[PDB]
Write a protein that binds this ligand. Structure first.
Ligand SMILES: CC(=O)c1c[nH]c2ccccc12
Length: 112
């Protein structure tokens, strides 16, 4: 299995996931200056910009590596934000719509 086609696939998949986050609330790290209690609750922050950096640093070499960080984006947001917020429901929506993107992309990776 070759590295370059796999990274091309992950780049495309990341772009498709970012397209689902229409408010761009997951595009960059949660601003810790605005939420000093965030790290009291969240052990490993994650966001799409950090994922892009990890991808280009060759830190994702299987689909699980990539999907685990996506799941952190979702789970951190569900954990930190109250159920009655836009942010919480945006993580639900991203889990649902992004899971579909991920299933098709993992299938492409399995074809490699
Ligand atoms: C994705 C997320 O939880 C957040 C994204 N931006 C934020 C700002 C304040 C509190 C939380 C957030």
């Amino acid at each position: 299995m070759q590295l370059t086609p796999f990274l091309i696939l992950l780049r495309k998949t990341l772009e498709q996931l970012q397209e689902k986050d229409t408010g761009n609330i997951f595009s960059e790290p949660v601003p810790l200056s605005e939420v000093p209690d965030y790290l009291d609750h969240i052990k490993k922050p994650m966001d799409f910009f950090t994922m892009k950096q990890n991808l280009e640093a060759y830190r994702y070499l299987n689909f699980d590596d990539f999907e685990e960080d996506f799941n952190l984006i979702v789970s951190n947001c569900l954990k930190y934000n109250a159920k009655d917020t836009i942010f919480y429901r945006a993580a639900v929506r991203l889990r649902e719509q992004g899971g579909a993107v991920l299933r098709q992309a993992r299938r492409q990776a399995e074809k490699m």
